[PDB]
Structure 1
Amino acid sequence: MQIFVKTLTGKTITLEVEPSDTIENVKAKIQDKEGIPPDQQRLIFAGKQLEDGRTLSDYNIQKESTLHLVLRLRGG
Structure 2
Amino acid sequence: MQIFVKTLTGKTITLEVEPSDTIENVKAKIQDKEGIPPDQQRLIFAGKQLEDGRTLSDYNIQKESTLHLVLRLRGG
Normalising TM by the smaller chain, what interval?
A: 0.7 to 0.9
| Aligned pairs for 1:42-61 within 5 A | 42-61=42-61
* Deviations 1:46-72 (CA, angstroms, capped at 9, x unpaired): 112112232111112122111112252
Q: Output the aligned Cα RMSD.
A: 2.7
Matched-pair contact (CA < 8 Å) for 1:41–1:69: yes
Residue segments in structure 1 that go unaligned for 5+ positions in a row: none
Percent identity of equivalent pairs: 100
Partner of 1:31, secondary structure, is helix
Task: Give 1:41 shift.
Answer: 2.2
Structure 2, unaligned runs of 5 or more: none
Question: Shift of residue 36 of structure 1?
Answer: 1.7
Residues 19, 57 of structure 2: 8 Å contact kept: yes
Which residue matches 1:28? 28
**8 Å contact kept, 1:7–1:68:** yes
